[PDB]
Design a binder for these strands. Structure first.
Lengths: 234, 96, 79, 418
RNA sequence: GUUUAUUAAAAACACAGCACUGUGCAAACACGAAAGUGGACGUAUACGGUGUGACGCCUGCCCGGUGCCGGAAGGUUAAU
RNA sequence: UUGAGCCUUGAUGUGUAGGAUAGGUGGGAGGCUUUGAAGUGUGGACGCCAGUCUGCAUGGAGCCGACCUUGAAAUACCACCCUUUAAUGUUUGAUGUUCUAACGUUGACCCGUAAUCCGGGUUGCGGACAGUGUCUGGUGGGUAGUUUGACUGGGGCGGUCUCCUCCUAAAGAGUAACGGAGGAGCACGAAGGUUGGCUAAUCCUGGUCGGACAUCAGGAGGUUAGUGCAAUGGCAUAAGCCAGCUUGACUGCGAGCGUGACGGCGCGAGCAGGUGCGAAAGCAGGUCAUAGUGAUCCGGUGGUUCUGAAUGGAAGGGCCAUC
């Protein structure tokens, strides 16, 4: 079972106890530290409170962010009675209810990001029974259960950051890879950091942001020179 | 203002306004308080030589009223659409 | 029984007759718990919720039954 | 053997609201069914109470079909998703409905919901009227293919009993015993009343109630925001009885509220049997003979019968079952103008009907206006010509000359002769 | 025996005797915010309380041992 | 002596599929994890042990998964925190025992003082207790302030109090009584909307099974039926009754009326905007009409910038909606 909690004690004793690091320095560090064999993940582990409401906490999904770059994804814009007819004028991407309808019901899919109005969305990104991915899968939520379609296509075309686990009040968001550049990464954090302050209007504690921490794997992680706080949005 | 043990009629009505406080520092001066222009220049702090106007002024509007036919100033004073209409027609500064 | 659960409170019917001012709404016949026993007709659309004669814009009561039989017909003819 | 809609949708909320709107049958009470056309079927109803998880878990496995519920303002909720998953694995069919559907025409259903490991979410009605029709039809069709289970003698009804007492004692636990001797939990709720309330349930046909507000071991689906609603229930407990049981403790019983509670019982006009529960841990010189004596002197002519049980031992268990039956026989006793008139004569001769304003009154027969709580109406002189006291004196006499281990008996007086 | 002075003398109140309980001394208890004091220069055959009412005569029922009675939870006896 | 607050180890997740054992991977099938890497207990969905069982005791294969499938998922390299569980670091509180040094000493003596008070000192005994101060739970008619209507053919007794209809009710109207009679505390998204359509009871007579019909057949009859739930007024232009189709139980306003002391309550066309249905005219602003409920507070929900005390935000409050 548990032999000795020694290998983890010496390691955590190095770089965690809220040792606040330059965001960029952290990333520089992040690729290796203890013998983790290949370049790893950049994560932010954000701790949010409570149960009974979420705004972007335990999301089996992806939301649009300032600085969407990091990845770009496949996108189809489903335009049915909604802010679709504004999307038809917009003419960005491909907009069409009944042809994209077919394409949805065909047998095969690849347009991961369904910007959607009513019919398409249910198919792609949610389905299965005991759903869950090969390691990654077409995801459902993309804020088109908060439908807008035209402006949505601009945001959509650009890309998008997926994060997911289950049910804990602490919202983890995987910031990116280390095959993405250090300063672009910083910007990913800052973007999510601005969003979160935004998030949650429903009082349960008036500062909902505890730890902005940045971490990788193999007992390797650090804290951020916290800069998410309430003052406006920073 | 009573009515025995039949219920207060105003306790048979609700409350509903709301104060401004800004309000008390918003004064209301007239067109014919350019009669008291006392200097060719309409300036808030000259109109206190008239004492026509608040001690703790922070705001004021100039409203209609009779005419005086003279150059005026008006800066930092609000002036109404109708109010400014004829004191424009007497010459005088009046841009704000 | 032994009861005396009472109090009456609808009131009002047939206010005025014939020339009635003339007015955009008349009471005409607001005439209650009925729809016929003062039957609608003339210068006025609809039989009100409680059955109202209330002008088309104006009206003296014209009254007076019609059809081959039937009703008693209250009619409104403009003032 | 037989289907049950079996509402779930997270532990609480409007979940109940929907059952009342699907039911209409009270006093069958709980279990309990929702009727549609010909066929009627039952209905059944983080970090939540351990007891409340155990009942709910108990409900869904016997459950035969299930209904999982979402609100208008509710959407997303991983906990709901877990409950939904549990249901799939264990294997019974589930339909996904959404409570007081609202929105602004069907929109956000079905879109979130496909991830729910369930597909088509039907939106409902309960405060409008179209949205109930689809659900009832869906269930109907398989259920139509099938066709599953759907003086008057003392034995014409099975004996009705409640278990009332303090807002302290773990009465609900004593309730679990009374229903048990099987060593099994039983306070699994189903829903069949108008609104969110409450268990009377029957075993052996005969009805038991659990009542008051907290400490009772009322930790339920919730419905009494204040101290008040619960009382609305105990008054139900009165309606349903011909027997009530008062649990009192020997270490928090006879509180001020409680002695009032017994005083109330007298109004309640239903048979009193007095229970003392969790009484194996009390001190060897009991406190408590005197506690019995103060209640005795108030005084309750009935048959007592004191019980000293625990819900965590059981001693009194048989003696309670027995006492209620004996009490019911006396209470429900076949009566009859003859008996009453004959014993009465003795009484008035012996101790003297009251005189009023130099005119002596006159009694002249009694008859029974019903027996179950025994009422008599005696036609004599005027209402004020007796004091309530003499009424009671003559009543007490009858209570004496023919056994009434049962409830207080009632006497009336009518006038016509004067 | 005692008593409603200034309506009411008794069957009322008291009382020995009896009964019951509480209290181990820095006592119970009582007064006195407490200090102190009384209780007591005493000391469980007492002390305090409470209660009943001479006297005589009407039989006042111990749960421990072991057993019994009802009951369940168990033990013990069962099918196994 | 012994509970538990925290700390990091433990490893994984029952339907066909799924090898079983599919909590939760950025990215997703290199990492030369060099060492010749493994199948052998905790773990694990669940004991459904199996086997697959563990970075979890063997050396035996290039440095090595010894690449995926396939479902929802599952094999290059792994990642993101939970339920759970230890081992270890602890952190802290209980009990257990003993002590003395606070503290107690209504023990004994010495002493101010040839003073039962007291004080100081010595010693004996108790002892971190006891007790008390705060805080704090339970109890508490002992003590304390007061509460316990009104109508009313004397009151109390009783019965009754709102809301509706009818009659009394004197023929505009309006209406007393402890008058006489009865009811109501909703129901209902179809029972609504709209189009198109359809036309009873009750009785005769005749016909399988057919009984005072159960259907069928005709005749008489003329709305006495039936109205969502009284009772009444009203009801064929049906309001009934049947079906298609719809979602106006829309929205923002409102001439002008009735009817209330006031609180106020009701009717109301049309315009405007948007809608819906209907071939089109047109109809649709909840229900046959008449009952189905309540001020004011104060707080909850959602929206708004309106407010907002140095100054910006931010709270609370107003507003709009709703509980």
């Amino acid at each position: 079972m548990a032999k000795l909690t020694k290998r983890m004690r010496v390691i955590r004793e190095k770089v965690d106890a809220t040792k606040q690091y330059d965001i960029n320095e952290a990333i520089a560090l992040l690729k290796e530290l203890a013998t983790a064999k290949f370049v790893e993940s950049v994560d932010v582990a954000v701790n949010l409170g409570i149960d009974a409401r979420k705004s972007d906490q335990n999301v089996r999904g992806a939301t649009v962010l300032p600085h969407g770059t990091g990845r770009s994804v496949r996108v189809a814009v489903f335009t049915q009675g909604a802010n679709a007819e504004a999307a038809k004028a917009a003419g960005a991407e491909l907009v069409g209810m009944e042809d994209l309808a077919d394409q949805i019901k065909k047998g095969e899919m690849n347009f991961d990001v369904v910007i959607a109005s009513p019919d398409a969305m249910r198919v792609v990104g949610q389905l299965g029974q005991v759903l869950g991915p090969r390691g990654l899968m077409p995801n459902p939520k993309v804020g088109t259960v908060t439908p807008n379609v035209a402006e949505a296509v601009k945001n959509a075309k650009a890309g998008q950051v997926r994060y997911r686990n289950d049910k804990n009040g602490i919202i983890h968001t995987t910031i990116g890879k280390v095959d993405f550049d250090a300063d672009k990464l910083k910007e990913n954090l800052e973007a999510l950091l601005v969003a979160l302050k935004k998030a949650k209007p429903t009082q349960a504690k008036g500062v909902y942001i505890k730890k902005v921490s940045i971490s990788t794997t193999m007992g390797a992680g650090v804290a951020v020179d916290q800069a998410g706080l309430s003052a406006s949005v920073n | 203002g009573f009515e025995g043990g039949q219920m207060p009629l105003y306790r048979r009505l609700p409350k509903f306004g709301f104060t401004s406080r800004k309000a008390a520092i918003t004064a209301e001066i007239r067109l014919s308080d350019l009669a008291k222009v006392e200097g060719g220049v309409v300036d808030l702090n000259t109109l206190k030589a008239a004492n026509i106007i608040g001690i703790q002024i922070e705001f004021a509007k100039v409203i209609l009223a009779g005419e005086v036919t003279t150059p005026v100033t008006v800066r930092g004073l609000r002036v109404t659409k109708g109010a400014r209409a004829a004191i424009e027609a007497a010459g005088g500064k009046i841009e704000e | 029984g032994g009861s005396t659960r009472n109090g009456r409170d609808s009131e009002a019917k047939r206010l005025g007759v014939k020339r009635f001012g003339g007015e955009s709404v008349l009471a005409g016949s607001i005439i209650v718990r009925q729809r016929g026993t003062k039957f609608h007709a003339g210068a006025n659309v609809g039989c009100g919720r409680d059955h109202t004669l209330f002008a088309k814009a104006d009206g003296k009561v014209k009254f007076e039954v019609k059809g081959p039989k039937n009703r008693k017909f209250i009619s409104i003819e403009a003032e | 053997m037989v289907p049950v809609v079996a509402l779930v949708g997270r532990p609480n909320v409007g979940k109940s609201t929907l059952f009342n709107r699907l039911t209409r049958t009270r006093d069958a009470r709980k279990y309990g069914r929702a009727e549609i056309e010909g066929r009627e079927f039952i209905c059944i109803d983080d970090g939540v109470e351990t007891r409340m998880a155990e009942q709910s878990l108990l409900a869904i496995e016997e459950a035969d079909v299930v209904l999982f519920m979402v609100d208008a303002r509710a959407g997303l909720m991983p906990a709901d998703e877990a409950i939904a998953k549990h249901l799939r694995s264990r294997e019974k069919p589930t339909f996904l409905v959404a409570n007081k559907t609202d929105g602004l025409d069907p929109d956000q259903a079905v879109v979130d919901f496909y991830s729910l490991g369930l597909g088509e979410i039907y939106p409902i009605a309960a405060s409008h009227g179209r949205g109930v029709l689809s659900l009832l039809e869906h269930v109907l069709l398989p259920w139509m293919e099938d066709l599953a289970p759907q003086d008057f003698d003392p034995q014409s009804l099975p004996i009705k009993l409640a278990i009332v007492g303090r807002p302290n004692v773990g009465k609900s636990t004593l309730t679990n015993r009374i229903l048990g001797e099987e060593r099994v939990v039983v306070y699994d709720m189903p829903g069949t009343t108008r609104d969110s309330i409450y268990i009377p349930m029957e075993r052996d046909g005969r009805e038991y109630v659990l009542i008051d507000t907290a400490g009772v071991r009322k930790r339920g689906k919730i419905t009494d925001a204040v101290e008040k609603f619960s009382v609305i229930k105990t008054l139900q407990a009165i309606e349903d009885a011909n027997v009530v049981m008062l649990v009192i403790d020997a270490r928090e019983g006879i509180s001020d509220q409680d002695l009032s509670l017994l005083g109330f019982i007298l109004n309640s006009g239903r048979s009193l049997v007095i229970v003392v529960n969790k009484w194996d841990g009390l001190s060897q010189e009991v406190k408590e003979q005197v506690k019995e004596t103060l209640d005795f002197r108030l005084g309750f002519i009935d048959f007592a019968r004191v019980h000293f049980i625990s819900a965590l031992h059981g001693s009194g268990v048989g003696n309670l079952f027995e006492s209620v039956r004996e009490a019911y026989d006396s209470s429900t006793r076949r009566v009859g103008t003859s008996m009453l008139t004959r014993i009465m004569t003795m009484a008035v001769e012996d101790h003297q009907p009251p005189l009023v304003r130099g005119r002596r009154v006159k009694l002249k027969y009694a008859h029974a206006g019903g027996y179950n709580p025994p009422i008599v109406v005696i036609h004599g002189n005027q209402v004020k010509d007796l004091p309530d006291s003499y009424k009671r004196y003559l009543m007490n006499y009858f209570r004496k000359s023919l056994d009434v281990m049962g409830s207080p008996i009632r006497i009336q007086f009518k006038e016509g002769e004067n």
